[PDB]
Amino acid sequence: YVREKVIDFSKPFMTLGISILYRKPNGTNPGVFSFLNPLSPDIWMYVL
């Protein structure tokens, strides 16, 4: 709109819009220690 007053345009040959860009948010590395003992291992060796 601020560029409409100063210069003129043709028809838009294609339509676009504003989109948001981000990394593909996987962030997930499951393992042995996360699923086995998510608690303190001091508790586990006290149980031992």
């Binding site: 608690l39 303190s40 001091d42 508790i43 006290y46």
Partner: peptide, 23 residues
């Protein structure tokens, strides 16, 4: 002794009493 580790002292006291009472 953690947030769930507070039962260990009661376990140790009960084990000492179970050793001392039985024979």
């Amino acid at each position: 002794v953690q947030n769930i580790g507070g039962i260990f002292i009661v376990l140790a006291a009960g084990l000492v009493l179970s050793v001392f009472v039985a024979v």
